[PDB]
Design a protein around this ligand. Structure first.
Ligand SMILES: [Mg+2]
Ligand SMILES: [Mg+2]
Lengths: 144, 145, 64, 143, 70, 68, 57, 189, 51
RNA sequence: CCGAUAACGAACGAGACUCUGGCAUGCUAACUAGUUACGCGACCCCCGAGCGGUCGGCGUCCCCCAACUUCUUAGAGGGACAAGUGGCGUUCAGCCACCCGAGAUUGAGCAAUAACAGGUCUGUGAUGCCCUUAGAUGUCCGGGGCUGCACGCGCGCUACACUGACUGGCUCAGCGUGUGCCUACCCUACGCCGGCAGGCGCGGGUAACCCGUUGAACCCCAUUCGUGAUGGGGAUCGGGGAUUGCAAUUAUUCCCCAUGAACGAGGAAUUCCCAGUAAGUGCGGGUCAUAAGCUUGCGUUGAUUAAGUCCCUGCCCUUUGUACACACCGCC
């Protein structure tokens, strides 16, 4: 109720788009780059941003206060980085400050809904080759 | 209020030397005159200070006689000189705009004066070949056959 | 005159065929009569355990 | 509740601020508003003739979010796609004189000031009225 | 298509449009041989008159439908 | 597919299984740790490949004869 | 070519070296050119270790 | 509960045949808030079986060059289409979608290499994964050809094509191809 | 044929034809093939793969 | 590789190797990277929130005047091996499925014995021979040409459209370049003038310090258009304005206003391709006094099918035939 220094800072990133959630004890609220996640630009993906808080409910968030800083990538990758960073930050704060026995009954929900919530996508990109336009596609070759 | 076709409606109507479409948008319809682009239409309708969301059929006779005078007297009504066609003309040195068959006559006049002066561009025009220096080895064979 | 359409259960994939590997021989047995089992060449990715419809039963699949 | 402009939808905030700047005729505008294009790549002048108040409302919150922006910064922000005809498309910066005009008009309205370095930044009165607009538009949007 | 209404089409639209389920600009333009810009104009007028209810209001497409029966 | 061990790693593992058999074990981590010091493998990759083959053959020789 | 290459190969190998290869290409009293090889010991061609093992000239 | 696009609970949809019941991913554990999940369901074989069926629709929507990465456009397209089908039918959009795929699943085909000397087109059956793949491909390309050169919106044409295929009244393009492929299978059986 | 047969149990008759091949035709028709020197010394017929 | 085995033990190539990708809240540290906290502010609020909210506002190496490296940077290391389970398999080599895991096939670079009379003397002060050598085939300077078009072919770019175009608003990258021995040519913040392309004056940067927090495009959100060769397409063509150079015509490039051609998804044929891939989409670097429809890289968005087969087409091995060995472009 008045514990100081009760804070973590956990990142989750996808495709060169880093997202660090600075989590701390406080009243239940969410802000990313200073604005609420509801006021996000891809409202077609706003459901995915509110998806983590819906998985384990607003009750488990009502005792915490988190602010996220995001840089790099595109809009979609930033959304994925934000949501997985939120999940990782909350579970890390939980296991740091309260019992992990109660942590398991939410970590299993997170992983069972989507492994990407806590496991960042390892695939990043592929290098271009000097035989074609892309990494694998080659140029039109002709025999006539 | 998005009502029926008004009684003051011309399905097809004549402006200067060519008919224009009343069904189309007011700005996009008058561009059928030979010399007015969509930018010119959008600036001269605004100078005429009338509505834009209505079609050319709605355009009453007073509005038509306003827009024809506006489009025939550009510099008289603070149209920019750089917005014109015949800027700094090669005969009178006067900024102007050419419309309908006047544009055709002026363009043919430029071509035939190039022929008269026997310049490279004139010879290319008279031979039906490209004048901006682009290549003709493999392209433009459609125009010849 | 029309044989009823029913299903069969894949027991195991026998191998590829069709002169390009596009087909796949399979031993499948009907769940309506689990004793009888036939061989069929399927079009598409098939594993063992899943079920697939068969518009006819007396028909069999030869090689290729 | 203390509403920041970051706590609202930007689409609604900008249009409400443009309406505010139309009602307050303090903003001075040039006479070529019905004439010029807003960018080099644009094929046509913008549809709304109050686009000057639209752009003023845009640049006010842009300088709110980050200051020190000059004419080049404004043209980079407002730059867009150029079809380039048969050439493949590129990205081009917008007109710089229009950015000069909007910045000078904002300075004349006196909710923005020149900085000790390049670019300009808001006045306290500036974001006072900006947050006022944000609060009223947030109340209207919520209820 | 008719860019604007006439005697037969306007009152028919006012009499039958809020009586079937799907009311979209493309469907109404095809069904009533109206333009497609007149479709949007007349549909927003119907919405303001209160004979239909909106669903989406999206930039690409806008959906309306007849009032609920009760 | 494509997880066939090379003759180099196979022969090294066979040699060390014969020479240091008591010190080895059924655990991959124990095997790689003892392989670090009982031989000179300048590559970590070539070390733990040997360790995996060693564990696989230990599972065999605990319950039967092999070539080594 | 044979005598000189054999002698230099003897020097290089007997000085103590894992392997060495001398190749001489050109036209020698004949228009159709030819390439002679004299290789012994052990030689490697791929990967990083060739860079700090094999000295070329 | 899952509320795909905020509504349309998946708890009620059932698949009337088990050949597709074990390959459709409409069930509660595969129920997703949005048809946008980068789960690498093409990493290996049979991955796409558990991939959500609406995600399959969105993937199949983006086609023919000009729009090949616009998953957000396809998401809002399927959202609008589900809204249209819900307004003009009233039942579950997922239920009508799955029944449409079931109705359009081609249970037979021909391999065309029934004889290497001369075209014979030996008639073979179809695996259920191929059934669902061909059905969804047929439906998406039917809507694609429906909305090419008219006022008709892509969402509306997709909606009416889907409902026609679900009803199986022969007026859906996917059904028109499914029936004829089965017909050639009958002919050169 | 069995479906459309009038008789309940009609065993279809076979063909009994003995082909004669000149080696020029047989090799080109892949009835017989070239063999290695030791393989030629084998005279037993090839297996049928009947089971 | 394992296995039968007159073979056993080896060596090159492959593999192994180097770089690059993804994980380590473990270590090593950072005012040219910062993050939390603390303190000044400016604004929203007073209904009251008040340890309320925003700050890319300012400071806490301004040096005594907080810590810390999660975030960025990069070194040292570790980590993954078919390791675990199950199943198949001679039960060998291995194969498939699954748990846990960052990862259960990241891409490249390197690359044998040899041959191709393959391309290069127009890369070289590498060069054999031949030619020219003063009216020069040496060398400099002025002009033209390398673009020239009844036509055939190839590589590409723009499109034929509403899954779109226009107009406005929202808005997120990463490679990497940047002032010159010769060599006169740098990247650019900001203010003002111009509608634009541009011009002027103050600066910054030899560079994690400035450009730059690289405010990129696509995308997304609203408006108009409305199936019309239309508001698609921007070919051709007139007029005008600026930049670079000594020189812009045979238009160098760029800007504005004009006109608006074929094209309504393309015959037989043919190419490229399996995961952050195809594909869309912009940005660098090179070429540059002037400049990309090319190429080289980068990044964003982001899929369908398949985890197989010799059917076509090629290549390799084994067998076979040979009067060839200059090796079939042979012999005769
Ligand atoms: Mg190698
Ligand atoms: Mg023009």
């Amino acid at each position: 109720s008045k514990g100081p220094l009760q804070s973590v800072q956990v990142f989750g990133r996808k495709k060169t788009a880093t997202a660090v959630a600075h989590c701390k004890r406080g009243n239940g609220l969410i802000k990313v780059n200073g604005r609420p996640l509801e006021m996000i630009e891809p409202r077609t993906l706003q459901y995915k941003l509110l998806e983590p808080v819906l998985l384990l409910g607003k009750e488990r968030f009502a005792g915490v206060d988190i602010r996220v800083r995001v840089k790099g990538g595109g809009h979609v990758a930033q959304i994925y980085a934000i949501r997985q960073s939120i999940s990782k930050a909350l579970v890390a704060y939980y296991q740091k400050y309260v019992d992990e026995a109660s942590k398991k009954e939410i970590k299993d929900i997170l992983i069972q809904y989507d492994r990407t919530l806590l496991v960042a996508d390892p695939r990043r990109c592929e290098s271009k080759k000097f035989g074609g336009p892309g990494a694998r596609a080659r140029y039109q070759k002709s025999y006539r | 209020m998005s009502l029926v076709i008004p009684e003051k409606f011309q399905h097809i109507l004549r402006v200067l030397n060519t008919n224009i479409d009343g069904r189309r948008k007011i700005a996009f319809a008058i561009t059928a005159i030979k010399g007015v682009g969509r930018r010119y239409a959008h600036v001269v309708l605004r100078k005429a200070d009338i509505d834009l969301t209505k079609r050319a059929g709605e355009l009453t006779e007073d509005e038509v006689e306003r827009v024809i005078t506006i489009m025939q007297n550009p510099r008289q009504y603070k149209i920019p000189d750089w917005f014109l066609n015949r800027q700094k003309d090669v005969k009178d040195g006067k900024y102007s705009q050419v419309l309908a068959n006047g544009l055709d006559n002026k363009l043919r006049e430029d071509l035939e004066r190039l022929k008269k002066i026997r310049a490279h561009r004139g010879l290319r025009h008279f031979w039906g070949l490209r004048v901006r220096g682009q290549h003709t080895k493999t392209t433009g064979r459609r125009g010849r056959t | 005159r029309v044989q009823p359409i029913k299903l069969a259960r894949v027991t195991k994939v026998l191998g590829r065929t069709g002169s390009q590997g596009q087909c796949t021989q399979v031993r499948v047995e009907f769940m309506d009569d689990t004793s009888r089992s036939i061989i069929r060449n399927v079009k598409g990715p098939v594993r063992e355990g899943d079920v697939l419809t068969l518009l006819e039963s007396e028909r069999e699949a030869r090689r290729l | 509740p203390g509403v920041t402009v970051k706590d609202v939808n930007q689409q609604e905030f900008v249009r409400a601020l443009a309406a505010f700047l139309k009602k307050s005729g303090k903003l001075k505008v040039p006479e070529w508003v019905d004439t010029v294009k807003l960018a080099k790549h644009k094929e046509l002048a913008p549809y709304d003739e109050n686009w000057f108040y639209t752009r003023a409302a845009s640049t006010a919150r842009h300088l709110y979010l980050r200051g020190g922006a000059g004419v080049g910064s404004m043209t980079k922000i407002y730059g867009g796609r150029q079809r380039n005809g048969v050439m493949p498309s590129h990205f081009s910066r917008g007109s710089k004189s229009v950015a000069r005009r909007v910045l000078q008009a904002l300075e004349g309205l006196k909710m923005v000031e020149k900085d000790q370095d390049g670019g300009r930044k808001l006045t306290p009165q500036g974001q006072r009225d900006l947050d006022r607009i944000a609060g009223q538009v947030a109340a209207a949007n919520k209820k | 298509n008719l860019v604007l209404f006439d005697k037969a089409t306007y009152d028919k639209l006012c009499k039958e449009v809020p009586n079937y389920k799907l009311i979209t600009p493309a469907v109404v333009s095809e069904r009533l041989k109206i333009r497609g810009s007149l479709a949007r104009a007349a549909l927003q007028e119907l919405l303001s008159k209160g004979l239909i209810k909106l669903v989406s209001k999206h930039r690409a497409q806008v959906i309306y439908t007849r009032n609920t029966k009760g | 597919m494509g997880r066939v061990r090379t003759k180099t790693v196979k022969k090294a593992a066979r040699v060390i299984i014969e020479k240091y058999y008591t010190r080895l074990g059924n655990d991959f981590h124990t095997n790689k740790r003892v392989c670090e010091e009982i031989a000179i493998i300048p590559s970590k990759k070539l070390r733990n490949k040997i360790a995996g083959y060693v564990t696989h053959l230990m599972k065999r020789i605990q319950r039967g004869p092999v070539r080594g | 070519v044979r005598r000189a290459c054999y002698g230099v190969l003897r020097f290089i190998m007997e000085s103590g070296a894992k392997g060495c290869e001398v190749v001489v290409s050109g036209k020698l009293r004949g228009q159709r050119a030819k390439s002679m090889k004299f290789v012994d010991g052990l030689m490697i061609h791929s990967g990083d270790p060739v860079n700090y093992y094999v000295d070329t000239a | 509960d899952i509320k795909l696009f905020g509504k349309w609970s998946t708890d009620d949809v059932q698949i009337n045949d088990i050949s597709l019941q074990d390959y459709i991913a409409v069930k509660e554990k595969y129920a997703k808030y949005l048809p946008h999940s980068a789960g690498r369901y093409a990493a290996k074989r049979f991955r796409k079986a558990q991939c959500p069926i609406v995600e399959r629709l969105t993937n199949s929507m983006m086609m023919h060059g000009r729009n090949n990465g616009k998953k957000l456009m396809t998401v809002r397209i399927v959202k609008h289409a589900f809204e249209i089908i819900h307004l003009l039918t009233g039942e579950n959009p997922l239920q009508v979608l799955v029944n449409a795929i079931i109705n359009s699943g081609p249970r037979e085909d021909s391999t065309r290499i029934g004889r290497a000397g001369t075209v014979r087109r030996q008639a073979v059956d179809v695996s259920p994964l191929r059934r669902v793949n061909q059905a969804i491909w047929l439906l998406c390309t039917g809507a694609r050809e429906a909305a090419f050169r008219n006022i008709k919106t892509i969402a509306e044409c997709l909606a009416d094509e889907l409902i026609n295929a679900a009803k199986g009244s022969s007026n859906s393009y996917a059904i028109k191809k499914k029936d004829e492929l089965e017909r050639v299978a009958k002919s050169n059986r | 044929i069995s479906e459309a047969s009038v008789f309940d149990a009609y065993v279809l008759p076979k063909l009994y034809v003995k082909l004669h091949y000149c080696v020029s035709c047989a090799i080109h028709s892949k009835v017989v093939r070239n063999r290695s020197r030791e393989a030629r010394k084998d005279r037993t017929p090839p297996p049928r793969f009947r089971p």
